[PDB]
Amino acid sequence: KVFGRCELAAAMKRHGLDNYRGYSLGNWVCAAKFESNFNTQATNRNTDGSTDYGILQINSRWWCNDGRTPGSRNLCNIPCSALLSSDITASVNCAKKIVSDGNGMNAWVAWRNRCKGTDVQAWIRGCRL
Numbered sequence: 001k002v003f004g005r006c007e008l009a010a011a012m013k014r015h016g017l018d019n020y021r022g023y024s025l026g027n028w029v030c031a032a033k034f035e036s037n038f039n040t041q042a043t044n045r046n047t048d049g050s051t052d053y054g055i056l057q058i059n060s061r062w063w064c065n066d067g068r069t070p071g072s073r074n075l076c077n078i079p080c081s082a083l084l085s086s087d088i089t090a091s092v093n094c095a096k097k098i099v100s101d102g103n104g105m106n107a108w109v110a111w112r113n114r115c116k117g118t119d120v121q122a123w124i125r126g127c128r129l
């Protein structure tokens with residue numbers, strides 16, 4: 001599924017991401033835009049052999065099991081394919097674990113390079129929330 005901007009904002013708000021660990025809703029929408037272009041089915045292979053999955057590009061090296069990243073962890077206790085669903089619940093639940101782990105949203109390279117320090121509230125402007 002390819003989400004619209006306000007559609008995704010409202011879905012993330014319902015799942016408890018607004019102000020989660022101090023990150024306003026606009027941060028999460030901005031990260032999803034530049035990680036996946038709002039597409040739940042996005043996948044990208046990394047040079048180390050791991051793969052990033054879903055709307056928030058969650059990495060198989062640490063967070064999910066895809067059966068092809070030897071010596072990796074599965075900290076969210078989920079198959080990586082669950083992160084490609086049109087239902088974002090699994091991606092949101094796993095993202096909450098990631099952002100709590102010490103480095104905050106810096107875990108997402110696109111957020112660090114394209115959202116951090118910008119007017120992120122623009123990503124939710126005009127949406128009925």
Ligand SMILES: [Cl-]
Pocket residue numbers: 109110113114
């Ligand atoms: Cl980047």
